[PDB]
């Protein structure tokens, strides 16, 4: 969901966050906060930047975005080269899994491993690998059953014809 709460980082520039009202990337309120290394720190920035929301978890978005107007410290020189970055989604309150679009001719699948607690990458790879086994393409996917910070017990996905 391209306009939901989320943050985007580019080291050397101020963090961006999604403006849910207009869909645009807004720079850091303080004019000082830059890129973060830990998922836990990303959760903390989510919480700081969306004070009216209860941020309970985070997850990688599935596709990178392009952002060109990164600000330097103190919010000026807010132009640089276009930069590809995968935003982190700031997940709100009780977990609701993504409603995936399933084009005609494609197939919705889901797998749950209630005995494991796994990464976004792992589930992405499970999804992709499943589709590939039948000569189809992974089209859209989402996490299921959070069990930790950016850790989940399952994946929902859509496989489409090549």
Coordinates of C-alpha atoms in Angstrom, one line a residue:
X1 CA 0.0 0.0 0.0
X2 CA 2.0 2.9 -1.3
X3 CA 0.6 5.7 0.9
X4 CA 0.5 3.8 4.3
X5 CA 2.8 4.8 7.2
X6 CA 6.4 4.0 6.3
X7 CA 9.9 5.4 6.5
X8 CA 12.7 5.6 3.9
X9 CA 16.4 6.1 4.5
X10 CA 19.4 7.3 2.6
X11 CA 22.6 7.6 4.7
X12 CA 24.1 11.0 4.4
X13 CA 20.6 12.5 4.1
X14 CA 17.5 13.0 6.4
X15 CA 15.0 10.2 6.8
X16 CA 11.8 10.4 4.8
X17 CA 8.3 9.3 6.0
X18 CA 5.1 8.8 4.1
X19 CA 2.5 11.6 4.4
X20 CA -0.8 9.5 4.6
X21 CA -2.8 12.6 3.8
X22 CA -1.2 13.3 0.3
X23 CA 1.0 10.3 -0.5
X24 CA 4.2 12.4 -0.6
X25 CA 7.6 11.7 1.2
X26 CA 8.2 14.3 3.9
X27 CA 11.5 15.0 5.5
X28 CA 12.5 14.5 9.1
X29 CA 10.7 16.9 11.6
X30 CA 13.8 17.7 13.7
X31 CA 16.0 18.3 10.6
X32 CA 18.7 16.0 12.0
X33 CA 17.6 12.3 11.9
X34 CA 19.4 10.1 9.4
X35 CA 19.7 6.4 8.4
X36 CA 19.3 3.5 10.9
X37 CA 20.9 0.0 11.0
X38 CA 18.5 -2.0 13.3
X39 CA 15.0 -3.1 12.8
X40 CA 14.3 -2.1 16.4
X41 CA 15.7 1.4 15.7
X42 CA 13.5 1.7 12.6
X43 CA 10.5 0.8 14.8
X44 CA 11.5 3.6 17.2
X45 CA 11.7 6.1 14.3
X46 CA 8.3 5.0 13.1
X47 CA 7.0 5.6 16.6
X48 CA 8.5 9.1 16.8
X49 CA 7.4 10.2 13.3
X50 CA 3.8 8.9 13.7
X51 CA 2.9 9.9 17.3
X52 CA -0.9 9.7 16.7
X53 CA -0.5 6.0 15.7
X54 CA 0.3 2.9 17.8
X55 CA 3.2 1.4 15.9
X56 CA 3.6 -2.3 16.9
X57 CA 5.8 -3.8 14.3
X58 CA 7.8 -3.1 11.1
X59 CA 8.3 -4.9 7.7
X60 CA 10.1 -4.3 4.5
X61 CA 8.0 -3.1 1.6
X62 CA 8.2 -5.4 -1.4
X63 CA 9.5 -3.0 -4.0
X64 CA 12.0 -0.2 -4.0
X65 CA 10.9 3.4 -4.6
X66 CA 12.8 6.3 -6.2
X67 CA 13.3 9.4 -4.2
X68 CA 15.1 12.5 -5.5
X69 CA 14.6 15.3 -3.0
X70 CA 16.6 14.1 0.0
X71 CA 17.5 16.9 2.3
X72 CA 20.8 17.5 4.0
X73 CA 21.0 18.3 7.8
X74 CA 18.9 21.3 8.5
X75 CA 16.5 20.6 5.6
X76 CA 18.2 22.4 2.7
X77 CA 19.8 21.3 -0.6
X78 CA 16.8 18.9 -0.9
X79 CA 17.9 17.7 -4.3
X80 CA 20.3 14.9 -5.1
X81 CA 20.4 12.1 -7.7
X82 CA 17.5 9.8 -7.8
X83 CA 18.0 7.0 -5.2
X84 CA 16.5 3.6 -5.0
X85 CA 15.5 2.5 -1.5
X86 CA 13.1 -0.1 -0.1
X87 CA 10.9 1.6 2.5
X88 CA 10.0 0.1 5.9
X89 CA 6.4 -0.1 6.7
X90 CA 5.4 1.1 10.1
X91 CA 2.7 -1.5 11.1
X92 CA -0.2 -0.1 13.2
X93 CA -1.9 -1.8 16.1
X94 CA -3.3 -5.3 15.6
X95 CA -1.9 -7.1 12.6
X96 CA -4.0 -7.4 9.5
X97 CA -2.5 -9.3 6.5
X98 CA -2.4 -7.5 3.1
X99 CA -5.2 -7.9 0.7
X100 CA -3.4 -9.1 -2.4
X101 CA -4.7 -8.5 -5.9
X102 CA -5.1 -11.7 -7.8
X103 CA -5.4 -11.1 -11.5
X104 CA -7.5 -13.5 -13.5
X105 CA -5.3 -16.5 -14.7
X106 CA -3.1 -16.2 -11.6
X107 CA -3.3 -18.2 -8.4
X108 CA -3.5 -17.3 -4.7
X109 CA -1.5 -19.5 -2.4
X110 CA -0.6 -19.4 1.3
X111 CA 1.8 -21.4 3.5
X112 CA 2.0 -21.2 7.3
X113 CA 4.7 -22.7 9.5
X114 CA 3.4 -22.3 13.1
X115 CA 6.6 -23.9 14.3
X116 CA 9.0 -21.2 13.0
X117 CA 9.6 -17.5 13.2
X118 CA 11.1 -16.3 10.0
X119 CA 12.3 -13.2 8.1
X120 CA 10.7 -11.2 5.3
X121 CA 13.4 -12.5 3.0
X122 CA 12.8 -16.1 3.9
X123 CA 9.1 -15.9 3.1
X124 CA 9.7 -13.9 -0.1
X125 CA 12.1 -16.6 -1.2
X126 CA 9.6 -19.4 -0.3
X127 CA 7.0 -17.6 -2.3
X128 CA 9.3 -17.1 -5.3
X129 CA 10.5 -20.7 -5.2
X130 CA 7.0 -22.1 -5.0
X131 CA 5.9 -20.2 -8.1
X132 CA 9.1 -21.1 -10.0
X133 CA 8.5 -24.9 -9.4
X134 CA 5.5 -24.7 -11.8
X135 CA 7.1 -22.3 -14.3
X136 CA 5.1 -19.3 -13.0
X137 CA 6.1 -15.8 -11.8
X138 CA 5.7 -14.4 -8.3
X139 CA 3.5 -11.3 -8.7
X140 CA 2.4 -10.0 -5.3
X141 CA 3.0 -11.3 -1.7
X142 CA 2.5 -10.5 2.0
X143 CA 3.5 -11.7 5.5
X144 CA 1.2 -13.7 7.8
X145 CA 1.2 -14.3 11.5
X146 CA 3.8 -12.0 13.1
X147 CA 5.9 -13.6 15.8
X148 CA 8.6 -11.0 16.4
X149 CA 9.9 -7.7 15.1
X150 CA 9.8 -8.1 11.4
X151 CA 9.4 -11.9 11.9
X152 CA 6.5 -13.9 10.7
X153 CA 5.1 -17.5 10.6
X154 CA 3.7 -17.5 7.1
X155 CA 3.3 -16.0 3.6
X156 CA 0.5 -15.3 1.2
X157 CA 1.4 -14.9 -2.5
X158 CA 0.2 -14.9 -6.1
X159 CA 1.8 -16.8 -8.9
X160 CA 1.1 -15.7 -12.5
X161 CA 1.9 -17.0 -16.0
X162 CA 5.2 -15.9 -17.6

